[PDB]
């Protein structure tokens, strides 16, 4: 379930491009054991890109 | 076993990046007790571990670092270990290597592994 959260929240996160999005879902097919670090850092780079 | 990396280039901080390892020479088993890792060497810096993971489990482990940013992964049907690398920082600036162990890892060092791809080189402009 924590793959499966962190799958839709990555989607819809405003501050990611497109390139960036693919490359975090990709992460969670690749390695679902990391789901929470990986939902973490997109959360970090969503932060870090908004909007000034 | 024979290994080859690629899939490395220029790429814009914040982006990402996928980095493929071959593995060749004598044939895998799905569950062959091997251990597949990539490792990094920085500009002025000696290779430094970036993951692992066991080839039969598929169990992964990180290095601090890279957590959250890089996964590992393995498919067994075409005999590939392949790094994601998103939220790419200059400071990941390197070049990597596939590399491999015929067992299970005593360490986190170069010298746990026998066999090395050649290297990809991976450039994170600001």
């Known amino acids: 379930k924590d793959q499966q959260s962190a799958f839709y929240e990555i989607l819809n996160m405003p501050n990611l491009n497109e390139a960036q999005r693919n490359g975090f879902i990709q992460s969670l097919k690749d390695d679902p054991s990391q789901s929470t670090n990986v939902l973490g850092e997109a959360k970090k780079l969503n932060e870090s890109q908004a909007p000034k | 076993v024979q290994l080859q990396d690629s899939g490395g280039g220029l790429v814009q901080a914040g982006g990402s990046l996928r980095l493929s390892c071959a593995v060749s020479?004598?044939?895998?088993?799905?569950?062959?007790?091997?251990?597949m890792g990539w490792f990094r060497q920085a500009p002025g810096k000696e290779r430094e571990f970036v993951a692992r993971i066991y080839w039969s489990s598929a169990n992964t482990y990180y290095a601090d670092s890279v957590k959250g940013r890089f996964t590992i992964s393995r498919d067994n049907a075409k005999n590939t270990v392949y790094l994601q690398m998103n939220s790419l920082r200059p400071e990941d600036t390197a070049v990597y290597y596939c590399?491999?162990?015929?067992?299970?890892?005593?360490?986190?060092?170069?010298?746990?592994?026998?066999?090395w791809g050649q290297g990809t080189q991976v450039t994170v402009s600001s």
């Open positions: 590399a491999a162990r015929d067992g299970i890892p005593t360490s986190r060092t170069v010298g746990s592994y026998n066999y």
């Open positions: 020479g004598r044939t895998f088993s799905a569950h062959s007790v091997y251990t």
